[PDB]
Design a protein around this ligand. Structure first.
Ligand code: F6C
Ligand code: CLA
Ligand code: CLA
Ligand code: CLA
Ligand code: CLA
Ligand code: CLA
Ligand code: CLA
Ligand code: CLA
Ligand code: CLA
Ligand SMILES: CC1=C(/C=C/C(C)=C/C=C/C(C)=C\C=C/C=C(C)/C=C/C=C(C)/C=C/C2=C(C)CCCC2(C)C)C(C)(C)CCC1
Ligand code: SF4
Lengths: 80, 31, 42, 739, 66, 29, 66, 62, 135, 139
């Protein structure tokens, strides 16, 4: 149960969604970009916290923040 | 002259007073 | 000397309380203190 | 979803083992617990201070009870130089005959511990002579601890629980703490000294059934109110007075000779009573400074916003904008806690720097191991308080600081140039380490190749000027209390240096630690110490001023105080939090006080063993620190138990090796990091599930402990191994050469 | 890739041969090997003498045989 | 602008510093 | 070996009795046998004294990075 | 602020706060809220030298 | 300080001369240590008395601070020499040694160069020229 | 529901543990045109079948680790299910039937802040309040 907030500085480069190993992010239509897209995080209980989405965001001081919060059984990735 | 045999036990029961007053306060601070 | 003794008054009292607070009481205490940290909030 | 911990909900639903651990380390951060209001916060701060004061009093009653019960205070007090104080008894049911015999020491008939706290010297000076006086002190402190456990419980009842306005009444608390908590208490202590300690150092027994009848002075209660105050210092103790007897004793109770008692080599008790009396009056006067509810006094809030200096336009106090600081300090508990720790960290360094040079207690200068442990104790305590003063500076910046109220004030001007401050601590640290290590290892190389005359030896001629400006005639600067014809020496208009013949007799005597003789070896360590205090300030100041964030992660305030990192992106952000600068500065704090106390110990170990020329000729190069201090003085520590026997240092030899293990196991938590251990625990969790007859199963999943926790678990072992190793060294290397 | 491996080994063997040459050269003209052949008990083996600068001539300790 | 309050508080502390050096160098008594 | 056949070892049977406690390793091996590198200044072994301190610096210096 | 002009950044969260960069292109849609693409001579941290900005936190230097 | 006396009159230091080999190192230097303020242990020392050593606690300091600034000035002036060339990215990895030498000869008279850097208001960058963090 | 033939795999040690049938379990279902071999996310190698393939994995990251491997075999028809222990099977990937890199209509901006990250409020503003600085309904 992390918190992946997306800010208005996205450019719809789509790179944050590809890096996510757990499919938390996905693109929705938007208008504040030439791409007309913005990241959204509908599945954040699945967020593992790897911040691999933040490494891919190219906007300077990146538009997507993982906010490591209450860690549960699927946000810590336990197979046992 | 060291303290007598009984004076040790007097301290034992006297120190039982702050022993319970610690329970008074630890549980009142909602452990 | 070849024994633990006490010149101090009530020298029998370390004889029983050093075993008590150090290897007789803690396992009851660590059990009580275990039952408290692992109780359901139902 | 377990009940524990009840203060935070989202940690109670943690399915792993980190919730047992994080509950321990969050249990006192009341401002972050779930469902906490500011009103409820202070009322739990207040009530847990009562629970803390009682622990100090129950700890203090344990000191008294065990020397009353198992100490040798009666035997010790008849010869405080040649017999060792007993801490308590030993009951280890697994000693052999060699440890019973070895630890049956200091005139005891059972295994005992030698007290290295100095409480024997403290109680002997303040007027305690019988074991029963110690016992009723122990019983009184138990009951005094009871009335604070009750008071803490009392002030959580709704009818007695204070309101938020009472806590934020800063002017009323300062008025009482200055006037009553410090002023009256030190007035009361001068009452004990005048009535009990001073008379009982002259032989007469003053007790609770006695003190109401016998006045402490022949002119009691009347010389004071008439104004004939000089009657209290007519005939003081002579130089041939011997302690706790009537021979050589005087009648003065408030006299200001200065210097040391020639027989105990401590400060005069009459000189201390006059001290706390003067401190009390100054403190009580200071406590009538702030208005409470009588419209005569000061208002701290208005002393901030004031911008008029006798009609001249100024920006504030000292022509610096302090507006909004009252509401900043008053609402911030971490600002207040940071200031309190910084002021105890100075008062605890000042305790250590003064109680070795100016021994207050009787015969404590002749108990080297007690004298050595007391210094190292309070300097290490002061180092931690200095780290925590700067820790809570970093919490203050993150949580309870805003740019709105502090717009344009003195606090916001610091952040405007936080990089000018950090760059300059970086310069001084770089300057002081290049030219202190470089000057030490130049001296190493020259001594190594025989040319010990080619060492660069810089006489510390500025500190030697201080000593000459205080009385030391050894060097020959011949100025300003080394010059008997100067304005300062004589005080020409009044000639009221009643304190000067006694002080100059003490500073110019070489048998005490008051203003020790200073040489080139002392110069170099004071730059190691200066380098130490600058880097650990650099780490802490960098961590406080970058707590709001810097270009590597400009949003640190959102992530809190103690977070691991911000991932491997942007190059990698390990140890980026403000917490990791407090963690990184504990290493430098321990290191720096491992130079302060190493230098204090070796300098005194050369004076105590008479081999002063060993420190002066070999502290200028680093091998001398390593051969003549560590290798030389370890010899009797490590032989505490050999194949051929065991002696009274067998426990110090064991804790010395205990602290080496606790230090080494710290490197495990500090070098190897979390994800290694999770892949190994994941494997052990596989093994447990797949094996027969193992009927237990984890209620909460075993995970490798977190990133910011291992940094804390490894910092605890480094600290415990730093303190057990040096505590065992310092005790055994001092209490084996000597008594 | 394999052509780089095989060619880099040759430049490595060159480095070992430079180092082996340095051992025999020092044993040739900077050692007491002649003295140590006569009495290999009381003479200590020593190559790599030290230049007289910086006071480091003290490292040229006595080896037996002057 | 000419610094009038930073100066005369820096030059004041140098003054105290130069007095200390004056006794240090055995100049004034 | 003397003129009878008995052997006087360098530390003299020290391993059997004192290498079984790791306090014996610290005093009978590390403290005892470092006498030659500790007391090595102003002698020909002076450079091993500097390397012995040099190694201590680099170890402590490594912990900055670790 | 047209293409080719050296411009200064007034965005405190940015790596290039109070540093100059050349404008690479301007977006003429007018509905993108960060039309300016400005290019920098210093990469920020393991990455880019290009970032999108609005009209109001830029000031031209030449 | 008066505890320090010259090694001329120092019993602990003539003893250093007595048991001294020569070889290159303990005669030619050790005669020159006879003019130094010498402690009560026969070890030359650096004291700060008055005009007696006011020139000798200025020869090392003037020689260092000049050549430290000389390294700093030539290194600084070579950096701006290539920032203006717009080639400073690779001008630094591949040192332009004719330019660097010409920046060293500018750094011989660097103390008078820094003054006219300062007096022109050109040495120090203005505060809102400088990349900073959020603060 | 879910069905398919399991790949040729000799069984591993990295597979499902007691968390599989107690908390929940994942299933990736894909169709392959060829009988080739793929790397198991739980260590090893398995031969994927000719028709409908079904594989049970302990956590979702393994399934999308394997799904990212299937795109290197030019297979983009995989579906990831989540099997609760009581037995019902949810469809979780791709949630709308199209892959999340693609943009649909009808998806909503969820956890979107309409401000720059730079002007998140200071922690003193939300002092002793339920929210954090990053939810912060201002702007
Ligand atoms: C119950 C529970 C349980 C069980 C049962 O049931 C178990 C079991 C197992 C088996 C099967 C195996 C083998 C065994 C042996 O060999 O050896 C021993 C050990 C022990 C520990 C032993 C133990 C046993 C039991 C516990 C006993 C009991 C005790 C008592 C009861 C206590 C007392 C009480 C009071 C209160 C205190 C194991 C192991 C391991 N562990 Mg394991 N456990 C467990 C627990 C635990 C905990 C808590 C921890 C943390 C510390 C751990 C850890 C670990 C590690 C590291 C490892 C390893 O290495 C190993 C392995 O992997 O393989 C391979 N683990 N495991
Ligand atoms: C005379 C009235 C009085 C007295 C005696 C006290 C006493 C105390 N108060 Mg209280 N308080 C008062 C009025 C008073 N208060 C009023 C009117 C208010 C309303 C605003 C408060 C609100 C208040 C709060 C919120 C708290 C206290 C607390 C405390 C306790 C302090 C903790 C402690 O004991 O540490 C030690 C005591 C010492 C004297 C230590 C002395 C050593 C110091 C550190 C060094 C002194 C050296 C000196 C400063 C040197 C410089 C002198 C100079 C001349 C050079 C203490 C017993 C704390 C508490 O609750 O504890 C349970 C606390 O949380 N008070
Ligand atoms: C190396 C530095 C150093 C030195 C020389 C000392 C020396 C001393 N300390 Mg210590 N202490 C230090 C650092 C040091 N301290 C630090 C950094 C802390 C903060 C944790 C403490 C906290 C502390 C406490 C609470 C007490 C002392 C006490 C003492 C005195 C008696 C113990 C003794 O005989 O010496 C032995 C040498 C040692 C290194 C042992 C010191 C005692 C340790 C540090 C206590 C650790 C507290 C621990 C958290 C609680 C134990 C857990 C418990 C549940 C079992 C002695 C003068 C006692 C005292 O006040 O005298 C009456 C005492 O009550 N100190
Ligand atoms: C905190 C002060 C303190 C400390 C550090 C000690 C320490 C010690 N005591 Mg104790 N004791 C104390 C106070 C203290 N005592 C008081 C006030 C009394 C009067 C009743 C006693 C009476 C007493 C007896 C009869 C004996 C000891 C003994 C001992 C030794 C073995 C441990 C033990 O069994 O004790 C047992 C504990 C008690 C009897 C009660 C003491 C608990 C005190 C009152 C409060 C301590 C709680 C503390 C403040 C909270 C911190 C907990 C946590 C935060 C760390 C040990 C050195 C034994 C001994 O002589 O060794 C040879 C022995 O048998 N003590
Ligand atoms: C708060 C601290 C304190 C307290 C409670 C007392 C209390 C007392 N003093 Mg005392 N005194 C004190 C501080 C204190 N003193 C200090 C700091 C000095 C040094 C100036 C004195 C010097 C002093 C003298 C000379 C005498 C007293 C006397 C007394 C007793 C009778 C005075 C009275 O008013 O009733 C009384 C028990 C008188 C007395 O009757 O002695 C028993 C008396 O002779 N005091
Ligand atoms: C009056 C002094 C004082 C007070 C009231 C506080 C209060 C607080 N501090 Mg703290 N601090 C202080 C001094 C103080 N500090 C000093 C002197 C330092 C320097 C070391 C620090 C550095 C510091 C840091 C880095 C942090 C705090 C934090 C906190 C807050 C949470 C407390 C907590 O973590 O839960 C309870 C804490 C514990 C239960 C401690 C765990 C165990 C410790 C390590 C002791 C282990 C000793 C060991 C067992 C002894 C060995 C026994 C034997 C083998 C020898 C709290 C408001 C945290 C914070 O600010 O929250 C955001 C935070 O991260 N402080
Ligand atoms: C022997 C161990 C060792 C040494 C030499 C250092 C040295 C240094 N530390 Mg470090 N530190 C250490 C252990 C050590 N640390 C450990 C275990 C920790 C805990 C992780 C830290 C954590 C730490 C922090 C957080 C910081 C430092 C900083 C510094 C530097 C500032 C002091 C200075 O400039 O003096 C001069 C330089 C030296 C003394 C190094 C020697 C010079 C070499 C030998 C030049 C010759 C090279 C040539 C090849 C031969 C310095 C290089 C601070 C810093 O970087 O200042 C800006 C800084 O903030 N240290
Ligand atoms: C001296 C410091 C120290 C100690 C004690 C350890 C201990 C351990 N390491 Mg470690 N390590 C260290 C330094 C240390 N390391 C450092 C400096 C590094 C940096 C590179 C590492 C890196 C490292 C790695 C990468 C690994 C380990 C592993 C291990 C574990 C090996 C299993 C084992 O030996 O069982 C025996 C336990 C001991 C030898 C510890 C001492 C036991 C004492 C003597 C008995 C205690 C008695 C009793 C229980 C006390 C409890 C009483 C109660 C009151 C508390 C073990 C606990 C390996 C592991 O996890 O194994 C599966 C592992 O993979 N270490
Ligand atoms: C010519 C290039 C140059 C110049 C003019 C400076 C100038 C400065 N540096 Mg710097 N530095 C440099 C290169 C340079 N540095 C390099 C290459 C490094 C990496 C080793 C550093 C690392 C560094 C640190 C960590 C710090 C400085 C600091 C400083 C400032 C004051 C301290 C000082 O005198 O220098 C310090 C010099 C060093 C630490 C060693 C570098 C010197 C070598 C010989 C550079 C020569 C290169 C050659 C000319 C080409 C000063 C303005 C300090 C500061 O922040 O200002 C207050 C500071 O903390 N420097
Ligand atoms: C003389 C003396 C002394 C003293 C000293 C002092 C006390 C001082 C000071 C001083 C000061 C108070 C200072 C300073 C400063 C400030 C500033 C502000 C600065 C600066 C700088 C700069 C600016 C630099 C520049 C440069 C150069 C010069 C070159 C290179 C480059 C560079 C850029 C780096 C002593 C005892 C030691 C010794 C003897 C005598
Ligand atoms: S959050 Fe970053 S990676 Fe994702 S669309 Fe926006 S700019 Fe691109």
């Amino acid at each position: 149960s992390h918190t992946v907030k997306i800010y208005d500085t996205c450019i719809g480069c789509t790179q944050c969604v590809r890096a996510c190993p757990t499919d938390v992010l996905e693109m929705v239509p938007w208008d504040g970009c030439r791409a007309g897209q913005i990241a959204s995080s509908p599945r954040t209980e699945d967020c593992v916290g790897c911040k691999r989405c933040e490494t891919a965001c190219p906007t300077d001081f990146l538009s997507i923040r993982v906010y490591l919060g209450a860690e549960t059984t699927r946000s810590m990735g336990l197979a046992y | 002259m060291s303290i007598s045999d009984t004076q040790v036990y007097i301290a034992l029961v006297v120190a039982l007073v702050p022993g319970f007053l610690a329970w008074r306060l630890a549980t009142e601070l909602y452990k | 000397m070849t024994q633990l003794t006490g010149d101090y008054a009530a020298s029998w009292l370390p004889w029983i309380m050093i075993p008590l607070v150090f290897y007789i009481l803690p396992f009851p205490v660590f059990a009580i203190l275990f039952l408290w940290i692992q109780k359901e909030a139902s | 979803a377990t009940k524990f911990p009840k203060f935070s909900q989202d940690l109670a639903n943690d399915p792993t083992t980190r919730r047992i651990f994080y509950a321990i380390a969050t249990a006192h951060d009341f401002e972050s617990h779930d469902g906490m209001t500011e009103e409820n916060l202070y009322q739990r701060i207040f009530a847990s201070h009562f629970g803390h004061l009682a622990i100090i009093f129950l700890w203090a009653s344990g000191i008294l009870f065990h020397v009353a019960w198992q100490g040798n205070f009666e035997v010790w007090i008849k010869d405080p130089v040649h017999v060792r104080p007993i801490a308590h008894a030993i009951w280890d049911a697994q000693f052999g005959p060699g440890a019973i015999k070895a630890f049956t020491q200091a005139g005891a008939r059972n295994p005992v511990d030698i007290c290295y706290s100095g409480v024997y010297h403290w109680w002997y000076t303040i007027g305690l002579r019988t074991n029963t006086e110690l016992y009723v002190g122990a019983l009184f402190l138990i009951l005094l601890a009871a009335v604070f456990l009750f008071a803490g419980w009392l002030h959580l009842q709704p009818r007695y629980r204070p309101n938020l306005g009472w806590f934020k009444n800063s002017e009323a608390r300062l008025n009482h703490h200055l006037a009553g908590l410090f002023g009256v208490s030190s007035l009361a202590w001068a009452g004990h000294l005048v009535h009990v300690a001073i008379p009982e150092s002259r032989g007469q027994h003053v007790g609770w059934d006695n003190f109401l009848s016998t006045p402490p002075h022949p002119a009691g209660l009347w010389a004071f109110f008439t104004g004939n105050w000089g009657a209290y210092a007519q005939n003081p103790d002579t130089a041939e007075h011997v302690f706790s007897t009537s021979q050589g004793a005087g009648t003065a109770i408030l006299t200001f000779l200065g210097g040391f008692h020639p027989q105990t080599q401590s400060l005069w008790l009459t000189d201390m009573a006059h001290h706390h009396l003067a401190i009390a009056v100054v403190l009580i006067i200071a406590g009538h400074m702030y208005r409470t509810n009588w419209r005569i006094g000061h208002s701290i809030k208005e002393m901030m916003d004031s911008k008029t200096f006798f009609g001249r336009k100024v920006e504030g106090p000292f022509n610096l904008p302090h507006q909004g600081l009252y509401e900043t300090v008053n609402n911030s508990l971490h600002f207040q806690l940071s200031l309190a720790l910084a002021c105890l960290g100075v008062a605890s360094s000042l305790t250590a720097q003064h109680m070795y040079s100016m021994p207050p207690y009787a015969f404590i200068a002749k108990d080297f191991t007690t004298m050595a442990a007391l210094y190292t104790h309070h300097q290490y305590i002061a180092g931690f308080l200095m780290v925590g003063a700067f820790s809570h500076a970093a919490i203050f910046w993150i949580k309870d600081y805003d740019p709105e109220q502090n717009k344009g004030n003195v606090l916001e001007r610091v952040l405007k140039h936080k990089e000018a401050i950090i760059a300059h601590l970086s310069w001084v640290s770089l300057f002081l380490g290049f030219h202190t290590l470089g000057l030490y290892v130049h001296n190493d190389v020259e001594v190594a190749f025989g040319a010990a005359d080619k060492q660069i030896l810089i006489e510390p001629v500025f500190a030697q000027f201080i000593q000459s400006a205080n009385g030391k005639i050894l060097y020959g600067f011949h100025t300003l209390l080394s010059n008997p014809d100067s304005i300062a020496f004589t005080a020409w208009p009044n000639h009221a240096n009643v304190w000067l013949p006694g002080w100059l007799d003490a500073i110019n005597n070489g048998t005490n630690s008051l203003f020790l003789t200073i040489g080139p070896g002392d110069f170099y360590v004071h730059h190691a110490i200066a380098l130490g205090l600058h880097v650990t300030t650099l780490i802490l100041v960098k961590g406080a001023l970058d707590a709001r964030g810097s270009k590597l992660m400009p949003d640190k305030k959102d992530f809190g105080y103690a977070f691991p990192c911000d991932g491997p992106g942007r190059g990698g952000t390990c140890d980026i939090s403000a917490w990791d600068a407090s963690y990184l500065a504990v290493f430098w704090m321990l290191n720096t006080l491992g130079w302060v106390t190493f230098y204090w110990h070796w300098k005194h170990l050369s004076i105590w063993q008479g081999n002063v020329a060993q420190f002066n000729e070999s502290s200028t190069y680093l091998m001398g620190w390593f051969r003549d201090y560590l290798w030389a003085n370890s010899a009797q520590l490590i032989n505490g138990y050999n194949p051929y026997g065991t002696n009274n240092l067998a426990v110090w030899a064991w804790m010395f090796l205990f602290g080496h293990l606790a230090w080494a196991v710290s490197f495990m938590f500090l070098i190897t990091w979390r994800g290694y251990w999770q892949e190994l625990i994941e494997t052990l969790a596989w093994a447990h599930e797949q094996t027969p007859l193992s009927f237990g199963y984890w209620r909460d999943k075993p995970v490798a402990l977190s990133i910011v926790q291992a940094r804390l678990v490894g910092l605890t072992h480094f600290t415990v191994g730093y303190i057990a190793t040096y505590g065992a060294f310092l005790i055994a290397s001092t209490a084996s050469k000597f008594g | 890739i394999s052509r780089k491996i095989f060619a880099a080994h040759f430049g490595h063997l060159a480095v070992v041969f430079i180092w082996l040459s340095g051992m025999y050269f020092h044993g040739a003209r900077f050692s007491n090997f002649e003295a140590w052949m006569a009495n290999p008990t009381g003479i200590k083996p020593s190559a790599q003498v030290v230049w007289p600068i910086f006071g480091q001539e003290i490292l040229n300790g006595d080896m037996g045989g002057g | 602008p000419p610094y009038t309050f930073r100066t005369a508080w820096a030059l004041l502390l140098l003054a105290i510093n130069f007095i200390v050096a004056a006794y240090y160098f055995h100049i004034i008594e | 070996v003397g003129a009878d056949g008995v052997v006087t070892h360098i530390t003299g049977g020290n391993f059997a009795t004192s290498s079984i406690t790791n306090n014996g390793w610290l005093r009978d091996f590390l403290w005892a046998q470092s006498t030659q590198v500790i007391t090595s200044y102003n002698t020909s072994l002076s450079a091993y004294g500097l390397m012995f301190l040099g190694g201590h610096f680099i170890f402590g210096f490594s912990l900055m990075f670790l | 602020v047209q293409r080719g002009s050296k411009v200064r950044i007034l965005r405190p969260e940015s790596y290039w706060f109070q540093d100059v960069g050349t404008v690479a292109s301007i977006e003429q849609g007018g509905t993108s809220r960060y039309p300016v693409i400005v290019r920098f001579d210093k990469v920020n941290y393991a990455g880019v030298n290009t970032n999108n900005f609005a009209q109001d936190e830029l000031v031209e230097v030449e | 300080n008066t505890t320090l006396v010259p090694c001329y009159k120092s019993p602990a230091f003539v003893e250093r001369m007595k048991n001294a080999p020569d070889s290159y190192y303990t005669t030619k230097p050790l005669k020159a240590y006879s003019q130094l303020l010498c402690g009560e242990d026969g070890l030359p020392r650096i004291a700060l008395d008055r005009l007696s050593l006011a020139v000798d606690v200025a020869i090392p300091i003037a020689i260092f601070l000049y050549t430290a600034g000389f390294i700093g000035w030539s290194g600084r002036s070579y950096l701006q020499a290539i920032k203006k060339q717009d080639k400073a990215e690779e001008k630094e990895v591949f040192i332009d040694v004719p330019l660097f030498i010409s920046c060293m000869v500018m750094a011989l008279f660097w103390p008078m160069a820094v003054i006219k850097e300062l007096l022109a208001g050109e040495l120090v960058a203005k505060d809102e020229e400088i990349p900073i963090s959020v603060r | 529901t879910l069905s398919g033939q399991t790949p040729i795999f000799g069984g591993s040690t990295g597979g499902l543990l007691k968390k599989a049938e107690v908390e929940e379990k994942y299933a990736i279902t894909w169709t392959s045109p060829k009988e080739q071999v793929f790397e198991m996310p739980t260590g090893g190698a398995a031969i994927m079948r000719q028709g409908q393939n079904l594989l049970y994995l302990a956590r979702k990251e393994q399934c999308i680790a394997l799904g990212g491997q299937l795109r290197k075999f030019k297979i983009t028809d995989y579906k990831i299910y989540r099997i609760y222990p009581n037995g019902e099977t949810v469809y979780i990937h791709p949630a709308d039937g199209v892959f999340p890199e693609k943009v649909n209509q009808g998806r909503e901006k969820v956890r979107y802040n309409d401000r720059r990250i730079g002007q998140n409020p200071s922690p003193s503003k939300v002092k002793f309040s339920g929210i954090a600085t990053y939810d912060a309904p201002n702007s």
